[PDB]
Amino acid sequence: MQIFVKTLTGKTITLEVEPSDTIENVKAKIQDKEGIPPDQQRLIFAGKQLEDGRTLSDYNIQKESTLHLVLR
Amino acid sequence: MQIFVKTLTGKTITLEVEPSDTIENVKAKIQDKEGIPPDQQRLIFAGKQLEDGRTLSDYNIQKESTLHLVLRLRGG
């Protein structure tokens, strides 16, 4: 799966993810690409913030979806 | 400071919050009390939906305010 991760601050990155991927894991993925540590980041999908435990699919995140990064 | 959350059954509970607590931290106390996961919650104050990254002070939520718990039926 290919998901897009927009940093509220403009630009959209791409992440090749697996459906079973936990948000916690996609954060560790955004760490490598943006340098912000997982505990300092906040991912929003369609209005809501997703918790680290649940996986991408638990929030029905399909292919080519845009995610939003917010710095806490 | 103590504040109230009107729950699903329209009942009212009290929470011990600090002015600098964010909406995120609030929801989790609300999870403790009502068992509702933080992702299924929607808090409404003054007929408005508050977001996770703001603190209570950002809403000028004073002592003894009464927020509302709404269960998220869906969304994405």
Curated annotation (Swiss-Prot), chain B:
Substitution effect: residue 74 to G: No effect on ADP-ribosylation
Top-level lineage group: Eukaryota
Domain (Ubiquitin-like): residue spans on this chain: 1-76
Modified residues (ADP-ribosylglycine): 76
Effect caused by changing residue 65 to D: Phosphomimetic mutant that binds and activates PRKN
Crosslinked positions (Glycyl lysine isopeptide (Lys-Gly) (interchain with G-Cter in ubiquitin)): 6, 11, 27, 29, 33, 48, 63
Modification type (Microbial infection) ADP-ribosylthreonine: residues: 66
Post-translational modification remark: Phosphorylated at Ser-65 by PINK1 during mitophagy. Phosphorylated ubiquitin specifically binds and activates parkin (PRKN), triggering mitophagy. Phosphorylation does not affect E1-mediated E2 charging of ubiquitin but affects discharging of E2 enzymes to form polyubiquitin chains. It also affects deubiquitination by deubiquitinase enzymes such as USP30. Mono-ADP-ribosylated at the C-terminus by PARP9, a component of the PPAR9-DTX3L complex. ADP-ribosylation requires processing by E1 and E2 enzymes and prevents ubiquitin conjugation to substrates such as histones.
Site note Interacts with activating enzyme, residues: 54, 72
Effect of residue 72 to K: No effect on ADP-ribosylation
Covalent cross-link (Glycyl lysine isopeptide (Gly-Lys) (interchain with K-? in acceptor proteins)), residues: 76
Cellular localisation: Cytoplasm; Nucleus
PTM-bearing positions, type Phosphoserine: 65
Marked site: Essential for function: 68
Free-text function comment from the UniProt entry: Exists either covalently attached to another protein, or free (unanchored). When covalently bound, it is conjugated to target proteins via an isopeptide bond either as a monomer (monoubiquitin), a polymer linked via different Lys residues of the ubiquitin (polyubiquitin chains) or a linear polymer linked via the initiator Met of the ubiquitin (linear polyubiquitin chains).
Protein name per UniProt: Ubiquitin
Source organism of the structure: Homo sapiens
